[PDB]
Amino acid sequence: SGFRKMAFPSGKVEGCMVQVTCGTTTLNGLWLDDVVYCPRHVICTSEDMLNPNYEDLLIRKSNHNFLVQAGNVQLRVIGHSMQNCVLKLKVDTANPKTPKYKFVRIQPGQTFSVLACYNGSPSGVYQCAMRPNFTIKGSFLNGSCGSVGFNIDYDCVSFCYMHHMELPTGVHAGTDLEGNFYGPFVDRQTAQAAGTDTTITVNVLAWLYAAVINGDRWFLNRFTTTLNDFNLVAMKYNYEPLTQDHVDILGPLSAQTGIAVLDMCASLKELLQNGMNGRTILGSALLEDEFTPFDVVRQCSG
């Protein structure tokens, strides 16, 4: 029993964190085999950030301009190349602690763990979700750039995020491990704004099924809804549209509890209308949206 926001064990990722220094800039790198991946803005100055020409800044650098530190050991850089917004530094030593891994690009609504690091040293781990506006509500201070997001399935680490910037509202923007940003963001100090955020409807529904699995049913009602009527009401509260894919994904949880997706949708419509009336759902007074249907099955069923 119990329901917590759980992060994946960070050990396999800790053994990959290194410190990358270029001139006066120090940030984090991900050392996998003989390559160190880090944000390409490590080559920029604060002035360069307004309108950086990364190709022109990189052509003026040599291998020995990049200092890479793994623990108390200096790695030797033997090559460098750019792939979108990530810099790939070829090193002379393969990481002996390289886990089984893959680079995956996630969609909004998907969750992942973040290992927050400063000076190549991990300081903490927390669980996140890619918001519908492509930002993450993380906890990052200066020097956390290059910190990574991941999931672990079986013995395989799936890297899905690398931290690059903090937006004016306090939210965070970054790229996949191929250097493609999530969202309409650029690694430029431009007037960039997150976009109006919405609630991940499929995740709130999954969390409502997790409350029913843990023995809480006070929010259920005798009503149903069509998918269209549910979406007309959901949009009025800034909830993401629920698609037929979302209804399909909730099938296993519907079969386990005996509550049809559209009947759980009717309960969500009523919660939006009435509020909780001093009650909580799984220790929360807000409707939780950072647990996917897959996370609920993993934490509850085994």
Name the site residues for a second copy (rule: CB under 8 A). 1-12, 14-15, 115-119, 121-126, 128, 137-141, 143-144, 166, 170-172, 214-215, 280, 283-286, 298-302
Nearest CB to ligand R87, comparing residues 15 and 195: 195
254 binds, among a second copy, ligand R87, Cl ion, none (CB under 5 to 8 A by kind): none
Site residues (vs Cl ion, CB under 5 A):
106-107, 110
**Contact in structure between 94 and 274 (CB atoms under 8 Å):** no
**Contact in structure between 106 and 162 (CB atoms under 8 Å):** no
Least spacing, CB of residue 230 vs ligand R87, in Å: 33
CB neighbours of residue 200 within 10 Å: 26
Phi-psi region of 215 (alpha: psi -120 to 50; beta: other; left: phi over 0): left
Least spacing, CB of residue 145 vs ligand R87, in Å: 5
Tokens of 222: 């005798």
Q: Which is catalytic among the residues 38, 41, 44, 128?
A: 41
265 is catalytic: no
246 is catalytic: no
Which of 228, 256, 253 has the alpha carbon at shortest distance from 242? 228
Give the SS3 label for residue 131: coil
Site residues (vs ligand R87, CB under 6 A):
41, 49, 140-142, 144-145, 164-166, 187-189
Tokens of 137: 């509500």
202 binds, among a second copy, ligand R87, Cl ion, none (CB under 5 to 8 A by kind): none
Least spacing, CB of residue 30 vs a second copy, in Å: 15
Strands 66-70, 35-39: pairing is: unpaired
**Contact in structure between 291 and 297 (CB atoms under 8 Å):** no
Least spacing, CB of residue 189 vs ligand R87, in Å: 4
- Residues serving a catalytic function are 41, 145
